[PDB]
């Protein structure tokens, strides 16, 4: 059962993209994709119960040695331990519902089986990433999900902005991939191996944690790397759900939790600044998918700070990752159903009422939104409150500012999520297209993720749930009051007259515009210099006329 | 200040474009359409208070000030219907143009299908 | 109409009638709204081949799984794998293969 969680989504992708799919068509390829995900989810459930609960890790030599020159030895080997089982359960369970949704959402697309094969490849490379036992097979998974993210973001290739969004995701992540590669070189040079179980670091040379942190900041879309994440909304809604829940953005946090070789000052500062920035960014957007994208960036900031706190903080970071994937995928699927019910419009000024959506879509948005804002005794309450209480008792003075930033971020999140519900359903109608979707497949796709939200409350992620870190009632129940403050403010729909702050925040602090000329235009101009002045000029040798 | 296109317009069409863009920017800055209706009424009453003017200098000063206001309050995220330019559904799955086909190209003039030297 | 146009597949019932897509192009994945006539039989045969691959990789995984620690209770891999060690619980006590405490401390 253990190799069935990794191979078999890759097999589904291989089937649906090869000339076998010429004989199946759309109708047969949908069956193949859904079955190939159901099998992998069943295998991951067995792996989860064996490794997490009964504590028996399994190591598999899959395809022998990859390459071995000198003392640099990379093998095709997996290891299934606690983190790997957690990640496999989360990835396969989310990707199954996203496949069941995409087989109905992209029904009218002309190349449906190609899209399903790309989704399966993306899932399989994520499984390869988390199942690897050494750094090089991890890099296979890293670049595989990067390539499949490029193929899926720029799926509608006749649209130029989608193509440029895919290229932007590739380039922004390529900077951090370079830094991560140099960090792998440092790690191997000063420890002698590439396998995770032999990488126990107490005191290393600083470049190790910094360069691995930069490589993780690329994929997890932290500060000065978040710019690709918002533009990745050019792709279809299943792509966004799988990018923001289970694949891609959770890979850097997984890598930092696995290695635990960071220096906590950088991690805490980057995470808290990212959380506050993405909180204020999502409060001032009107595109329905961009608000959810910025909430993803904000929660990744929370997890970054938590893994900065310590080993218990690393466990809480993995726990928040696991519970975040379910309600984030549910939020994106419900938003896709609302968009399709309103004629493709993504602006929240053109919604309202309870006619453009099913009852189940509204229930899904409500329950996932309540889990995200930390409503008591739902799924996100346990993990988010654990991170907040662990940040309130850290003995680092830097974590004092980080906790304040997290509390402000919590109020902002409960503001804009309540605004997303309020604009979508509570206000009067201001669109003109009412085509509500009530198909069986997307409704069952949403119901599965709501079942996982219930499961996280009933069965915890780890042993931290129910442990009491001893805090006064004032410190403990303040995030509930911040949630209520966000709800009351957003339902009052109040606004400020400070329009220059509004347009500074709504334009997202001008990061893209400043990047358009601080590295980008200089790279183009230095290329002009090296070609025209150097190759055609200073180094050019002419002819002798006679 | 207006762009080089709007500065080339006749005066009637210049004022009409200013009123139209003001209504659209009020749509962009509002939360809903039901928020937008009394702001649209107020903008209409604002233009009605300068209808009976004759002095071209006062007309020019009011026109230029309003164009400066519209350049200031240009929304960074305008509301565009999805299937038009700048919308989210523009240029996704267009019908293919007619592409020509050459049947059995390898079988035409075999043994002489390389590059000359 | 060209001579070779009679050999080509029509636009399928999934494709909108006003959509044009140059039917001469061979796409490796199937192309525009692919809907072959015998698709249910092909789907069943590909499901059978996938089941063959599933059995092959289940056998390979079972042959190559290494457990360096005994589990802390009964695991479902005991049913199909004979290399799974006997469970040793959280207190260090050796257990039976069905996951119960042996005689001397049971009931």
């Amino acid at each position: 059962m253990f190799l069935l969680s990794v191979f078999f989504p890759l097999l589904g992708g291989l089937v649906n993209t090869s000339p076998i799919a010429r004989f199946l068509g759309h109708r047969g390829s949908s069956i193949i994709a859904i079955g190939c995900m159901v099998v992998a989810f069943i295998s991951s459930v067995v792996i989860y119960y064996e490794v997490v609960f009964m504590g028996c890790a399994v190591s598999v030599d899959v395809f022998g040695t990859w390459f071995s020159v000198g003392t640099f030895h990379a093998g095709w080997t997996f290891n299934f331990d606690l983190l790997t089982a957690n990640m496999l359960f989360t990835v396969t369970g989310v990707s199954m519902a996203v496949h069941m949704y995409a087989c109905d959402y992209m029904r009218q697309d002309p190349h449906l089986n190609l899209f399903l094969g790309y989704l399966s490849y993306f899932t399989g490379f994520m499984c390869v990433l988390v199942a690897a036992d050494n750094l090089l097979v991890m890099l296979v998974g890293w670049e595989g999900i990067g390539v499949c993210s490029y193929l899926l973001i720029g799926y509608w290739s006749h649209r130029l902005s989608a193509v440029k969004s895919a290229q932007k995701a590739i380039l922004v992540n390529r900077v951090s991939d370079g830094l991560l590669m140099w960090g792998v070189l440092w790690v191997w040079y000063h420890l002698g191996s590439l396998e995770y179980d032999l990488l126990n670091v107490y005191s290393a040379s600083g470049f190790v944690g910094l360069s691995i942190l930069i490589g993780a900041m690329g994929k997890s879309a932290q500060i000065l790397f978040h710019v690709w994440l918002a533009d990745a909304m050019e792709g279809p809604t299943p792509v966004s759900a799988l990018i923001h829940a289970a694949t891609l953005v959770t890979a850097g946090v997984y890598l930092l939790v696995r290695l635990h070789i960071h220096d906590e000052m950088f991690v805490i500062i980057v995470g808290s600044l990212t959380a506050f920035m993405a909180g204020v960014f999502g409060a001032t957007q009107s595109d329905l998918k961009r608000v959810i994208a910025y909430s993803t960036c904000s929660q990744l900031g929370y997890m970054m700070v938590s893994l900065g706190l310590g080993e218990t903080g690393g466990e809480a970071s993995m726990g928040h990752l696991m519970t975040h994937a379910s309600f984030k995928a549910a939020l994106f699927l419900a938003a896709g159903m609302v968009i399709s019910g309103n004629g493709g419009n993504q602006h929240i000024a053109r919604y309202g009422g309870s006619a453009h959506s099913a009852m189940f879509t509204m229930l899904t948005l409500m329950v996932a939104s309540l889990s995200l804002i930390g409503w008591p005794e739902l799924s996100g309450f346990y993990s988010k409150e654990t991170i907040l209480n662990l940040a309130a008792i850290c003995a680092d003075p830097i974590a004092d500012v980080a906790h304040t930033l997290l509390l402000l971020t919590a109020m902002l999140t409960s503001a804009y999520t309540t605004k997303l519900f309020y604009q979508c359903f509570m206000v009067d109608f201001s669109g003109s297209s009412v085509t509500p979707v009530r198909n069986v497949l997307p409704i069952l796709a949403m119901a599965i993720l709501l079942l996982d939200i219930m499961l996280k409350v009933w069965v915890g992620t780890n042993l931290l749930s129910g442990m009491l870190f001893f805090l006064p009632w004032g410190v403990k129940t303040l995030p509930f009051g911040l949630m209520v403050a966000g709800i009351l403010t957003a339902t009052a729909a109040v606004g400020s007259e400070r329009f220059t702050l509004i347009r500074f925040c709504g334009s997202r602090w001008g990061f893209d515009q400043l990047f358009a000329r601080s590295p980008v235009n200089p790279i183009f101009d230095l290329g002009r210099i090296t070609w025209a002045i150097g190759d055609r000029g200073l180094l050019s040798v002419g002819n002798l006329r006679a | 200040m207006a762009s080089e296109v709007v500065l080339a317009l006749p005066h009637k069409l210049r004022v009409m474009r200013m009123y139209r863009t003001g209504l659209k920017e009020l749509i962009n800055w509002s939360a809903n359409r039901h928020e937008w209706y009394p702001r649209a009424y107020a903008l209409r009453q604002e233009f009605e208070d300068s209808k009976a003017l004759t002095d071209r200098e006062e007309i020019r000063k009011k026109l230029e000030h309003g164009e400066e206001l519209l350049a200031r309050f240009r929304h960074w995220e305008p509301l565009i219907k999805p299937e038009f330019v700048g919308g989210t559904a523009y240029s996704i799955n267009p019908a293919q143009p007619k592409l020509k086909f050459i049947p059995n190209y390898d079988a035409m003039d075999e043994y002489k299908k390389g590059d000359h030297l | 109409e060209p001579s070779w146009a009679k050999q080509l597949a029509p636009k399928s019932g999934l494709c909108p009638p006003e959509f044009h897509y140059n039917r001469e192009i061979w796409y490796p994945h199937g192309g525009f709204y692919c809907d072959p006539k015998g698709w249910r039989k092909n789907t069943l045969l590909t499901l059978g081949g996938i089941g063959v691959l599933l059995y092959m990789t289940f056998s390979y995984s079972t042959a190559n799984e290494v457990r360096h620690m005994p589990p802390k209770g009964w695991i479902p891999s005991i049913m199909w794998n004979s290399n799974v060690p006997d469970p040793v619980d959280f207190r260090g006590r050796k257990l039976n293969r069905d996951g119960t405490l042996p005689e001397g401390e049971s009931s």
């Binding site: 010429r22 068509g25 109708r27 | 086909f101 050459i102 049947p103 059995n104 190209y105 390898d106 079988a107 | 070779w4 050999q7 080509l8 597949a9 029509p10 399928s12 019932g13 999934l14 039917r23 001469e24 192009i25 061979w26 796409y27 199937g30 192309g31 692919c34 809907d35 072959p36 006539k37 015998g38 698709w39 249910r40």
Partner: peptide, 30 residues
């Protein structure tokens, strides 16, 4: 869906494009 259901027959017979641009001449083998 054609036929009124997901589980009906397919609706395409013949070549779904020509591999390598090769068209059969008079039904002869290539």
């Amino acid at each position: 869906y054609p036929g009124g259901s997901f589980w009906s027959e397919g609706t395409q017979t013949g070549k779904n494009g020509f591999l390598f641009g090769e068209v059969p001449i008079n039904g002869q083998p290539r």
